Design an enzyme around this catalytic site. Structure first.
Site, PDB file in Angstrom:
ATOM      1  N   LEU A   1       0.845  -1.147   0.089  1.00  9.21           N
ATOM      2  CA  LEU A   1       0.094  -0.029   0.183  1.00  9.21           C
ATOM      3  C   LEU A   1       0.795   1.329   0.070  1.00  9.21           C
ATOM      4  CD1 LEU A   1      -2.658  -0.937   2.563  1.00  9.21           C
ATOM      5  CD2 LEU A   1      -2.949  -0.810   0.204  1.00  9.21           C
ATOM      6  N   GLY A   2       2.290   0.912   0.229  1.00 16.08           N
ATOM      7  CA  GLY A   2       3.122   2.104   0.365  1.00 16.08           C
ATOM      8  C   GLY A   2       4.394   1.902   1.008  1.00 16.08           C
ATOM      9  N   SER A   3       5.283   2.808   1.116  1.00 15.89           N
ATOM     10  CA  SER A   3       6.384   2.684   1.708  1.00 15.89           C
ATOM     11  C   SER A   3       7.279   3.881   1.928  1.00 15.89           C
ATOM     12  CB  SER A   3       7.339   1.725   0.961  1.00 15.89           C
ATOM     13  OG  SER A   3       7.396   1.867  -0.283  1.00 15.89           O
ATOM     14  N   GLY A   4       8.202   3.969   2.685  1.00 16.33           N
ATOM     15  CA  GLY A   4       9.055   5.193   3.017  1.00 16.33           C
ATOM     16  C   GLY A   4      10.239   4.915   4.097  1.00 16.33           C
ATOM     17  N   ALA A   5      10.845   5.928   4.628  1.00 16.02           N
ATOM     18  CA  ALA A   5      11.930   5.561   5.459  1.00 16.02           C
ATOM     19  C   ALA A   5      11.760   4.781   6.601  1.00 16.02           C
ATOM     20  CB  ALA A   5      12.487   7.146   5.951  1.00 16.02           C
TER      21      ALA A   5
ATOM     22  N   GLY B   1       9.607   2.300   6.806  1.00  9.80           N
ATOM     23  CA  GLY B   1       9.412   0.894   6.233  1.00  9.80           C
ATOM     24  C   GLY B   1       8.346   0.909   5.125  1.00  9.80           C
ATOM     25  N   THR B   2       7.448  -0.328   5.202  1.00  6.12           N
ATOM     26  CA  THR B   2       6.629  -0.477   4.398  1.00  6.12           C
ATOM     27  C   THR B   2       5.098  -0.924   4.973  1.00  6.12           C
ATOM     28  OG1 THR B   2       8.474  -1.168   2.827  1.00  6.12           O
ATOM     29  CG2 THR B   2       5.893  -1.864   2.126  1.00  6.12           C
TER      30      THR B   2
ATOM     31  N   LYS C   1       2.192  -2.641   8.901  1.00 11.51           N
ATOM     32  CA  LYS C   1       3.168  -1.706   8.844  1.00 11.51           C
ATOM     33  C   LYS C   1       4.567  -2.513   9.191  1.00 11.51           C
ATOM     34  CE  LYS C   1       3.280   1.907  11.404  1.00 11.51           C
ATOM     35  NZ  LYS C   1       2.890   3.251  12.119  1.00 11.51           N
TER      36      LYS C   1
ATOM     37  N   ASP D   1       3.701  15.657  12.359  1.00 11.97           N
ATOM     38  CA  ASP D   1       3.471  15.445  11.115  1.00 11.97           C
ATOM     39  C   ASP D   1       2.380  15.501  10.399  1.00 11.97           C
ATOM     40  OD1 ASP D   1       5.046  12.761   9.087  1.00 11.97           O
ATOM     41  OD2 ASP D   1       4.880  14.749   8.603  1.00 11.97           O
TER      42      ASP D   1
ATOM     43  N   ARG E   1      -1.769  14.011   3.514  1.00 11.66           N
ATOM     44  CA  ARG E   1      -1.204  12.824   3.231  1.00 11.66           C
ATOM     45  C   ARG E   1      -1.126  11.764   4.375  1.00 11.66           C
ATOM     46  NH1 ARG E   1       3.318  16.320   3.353  1.00 11.66           N
ATOM     47  NH2 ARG E   1       4.425  16.052   5.435  1.00 11.66           N
ATOM     48  N   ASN E   2      -1.106  12.237   5.647  1.00 13.52           N
ATOM     49  CA  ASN E   2      -1.353  11.561   6.923  1.00 13.52           C
ATOM     50  C   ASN E   2      -2.522  11.267   7.460  1.00 13.52           C
ATOM     51  OD1 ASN E   2       2.295  12.466   7.412  1.00 13.52           O
ATOM     52  ND2 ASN E   2       1.621  10.644   6.438  1.00 13.52           N
TER      53      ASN E   2
ATOM     54  N   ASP F   1      -0.027   7.958  11.936  1.00 13.41           N
ATOM     55  CA  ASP F   1       1.263   8.311  12.361  1.00 13.41           C
ATOM     56  C   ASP F   1       2.300   7.401  11.810  1.00 13.41           C
ATOM     57  OD1 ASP F   1       3.596   9.348  13.753  1.00 13.41           O
ATOM     58  OD2 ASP F   1       3.020   8.180  15.629  1.00 13.41           O
TER      59      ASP F   1
END
Ligand code: 63A
Length: 280
Positions: A17-21, A23-24, A44, A132, A136-137, A150
């Site tokens: 569904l997505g990912s970043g710093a 994790g995923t 997550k 944050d 987007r969040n 979060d």
């Protein structure tokens, strides 16, 4: 709300569904052992603290129980840390408003502002600074119902702590209050600033704040008194609320409790405050 401890065999990942710093995040299925119930979830997986430390943080995070905050349902501790959270079927609110901007009316926009404020106020009651907040969040359970989530920047304040003093973590400059940018100070009132920017995102249907301005220039522009412009659909009453969220003195800014009241009032006569063609 309590923290379930999960075995690997209890859940399965279905797709990304997505990912970043951090994790995923995967869409997946939680089958609690012996319970014969399949629960759709978002898993997550993070990219080391002792297990006991991780659990204690997970216990606190799972106690957060509010209609407008995405809840931690469980955790699995193996080679990796995996957090099992409520799945929000419609994705993030930022993508949703961009996609559906032709069919979004004043009632939904103003209700989202109420709900996000309600969630943020709850976090404040729990002494949690989000740090944050952005469209987007914010995730979409249904078009009518959204939840703040979060991805690791949130901090719990101590009994005597009025602010969080950050270190070198990377920061979303264009959503940050001026004192956070200049001094790495974060409070609930700095979350209010970010709230104001998030509302601006919604009212412009997912437009980019300070479009084509380098993040490195933002603090100087804000110090000169410049702020994001009035969105086309906003009556000045709505814009003025956003502007109050961006006043240089944090205690000048409204509190989430006050934002709940003001937006709830507006949501009672939404076509009075947002001007949208064909609405309705
Ligand atoms: C605008 C930002 C954005 O889209 N994302 C995606 C993920 C969110 O991770 C999570 N997604 C969902 N549900 C969902 C995602 N896409 N669809 C169609 C549904 N539910 C979640 N519950 C907790 C976390 C969830 C993050 C990213 F990419 F950073 F991982 C931001």
């Amino acid at each position: 709300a309590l923290l379930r401890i999960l075995k690997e065999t209890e859940f399965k990942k279905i797709k990304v569904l997505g990912s970043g710093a951090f994790g995923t995040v995967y869409k997946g299925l939680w089958i609690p052992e012996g319970e014969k119930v399949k629960i759709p979830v978002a898993i997550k997986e993070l990219r080391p603290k002792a297990n006991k430390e991780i659990l204690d943080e997970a216990y606190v995070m799972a106690s957060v129980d509010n209609p407008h905050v995405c809840r931690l349902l469980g955790i699995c501790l193996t080679s990796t840390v995996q957090l099992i959270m409520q799945l929000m079927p419609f994705g993030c609110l930022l993508d949703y408003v961009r996609e559906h901007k032709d069919n979004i009316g004043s009632q939904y926009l103003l209700n989202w502002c109420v709900q996000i404020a309600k969630g943020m106020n709850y976090l404040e009651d729990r002494r949690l600074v989000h740090r944050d907040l952005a469209a987007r969040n914010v995730l979409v359970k249904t078009p009518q119902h959204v939840k703040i989530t979060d991805f690791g920047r949130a901090k719990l304040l101590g009994a005597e702590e009025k602010e969080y003093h950050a270190e070198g973590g990377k920061v979303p400059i264009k959503w940050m209050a001026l004192e956070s940018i200049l001094h790495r100070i974060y409070t609930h009132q700095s979350d209010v600033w970010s709230y104001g920017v998030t509302v601006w995102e919604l009212m412009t249907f997912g437009s980019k704040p300070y479009d084509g301005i380098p993040a490195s220039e933002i603090s100087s522009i804000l110090e000169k008194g410049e702020r994001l412009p009035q969105p086309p659909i906003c009556t000045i009453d709505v814009y003025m609320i956003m502007r109050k969220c961006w006043m240089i003195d944090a205690d000048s800014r409204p509190k989430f409790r006050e934002l709940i009241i003001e937006f709830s009032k507006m949501a009672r006569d939404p076509q009075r405050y947002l001007v949208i063609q064909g609405d309705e």
